[PDB]
């Protein structure tokens, strides 16, 4: 809560001391909680969600090393096509006990 708006060039803000050497790596960091520094941030939901999904995808790709994919518009349909091909057919409703019994979203693989 600095109260005086001030030009930039004097923002280096030095501590101006002999740099106490007794401190160890735990206290070199400024923190509120014991573990670290935490502060509020007004992130809209969509950006957080999309970049979080991106990070999770990267983690899975690193773990499984299966990262050989691209991204596009018709590419989206093309990737859906192979997975849909591996899926078995959804049955027809009004057929209930086997031999084409309807299973829609519950169709297995």
């Amino acid at each position: 809560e600095l109260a005086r708006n001030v030009p930039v060039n004097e923002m280096v803000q030095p501590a101006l001391g002999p740099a106490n050497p007794f401190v160890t790596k735990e206290q070199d960091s400024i923190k509120n909680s014991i573990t670290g520094y935490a502060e509020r941030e007004y992130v809209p939901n969509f950006v957080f969600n999309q970049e979080y999904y991106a990070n999770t995808h990267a983690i899975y790709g690193k773990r499984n090393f299966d990262d050989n994919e691209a991204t596009t518009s018709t590419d989206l349909k093309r990737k859906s096509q192979k997975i849909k091909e591996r899926r078995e057919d959804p049955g027809d409703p009004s057929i209930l006990e086997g031999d084409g019994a309807y299973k829609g979203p519950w169709a297995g693989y």
Binding site: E26, N32, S33, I34, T35, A38, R40, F48, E51, Y52, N55, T56, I59, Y60
Partner: protein
């Protein structure tokens, strides 16, 4: 502002973006036996969510991690 729980990054997952819930007064500290809020998060996909086990008064007197009960220095 009762902002955040002290949790080590070993059990906070290797993802830089996590989602976690808090329910005030939902538990008693396992040392203080004082009311305390739980924080539940997912360390990684394919794992049961973790949760804090002690209040913030503890893990301050003990310099420890509220979830995995390990000291934050050693």
């Amino acid at each position: 502002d009762v902002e955040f729980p002290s949790i080590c990054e070993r059990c906070l997952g290797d993802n830089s973006y996590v989602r976690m819930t808090k329910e005030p007064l939902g538990q008693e500290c396992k040392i203080c036996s004082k009311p305390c809020t739980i924080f539940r998060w997912i360390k990684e996909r394919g794992q049961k969510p973790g949760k804090t086990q002690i209040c913030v008064g503890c893990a301050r007197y003990k310099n420890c991690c509220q979830s995995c009960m390990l000291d934050l220095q050693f």
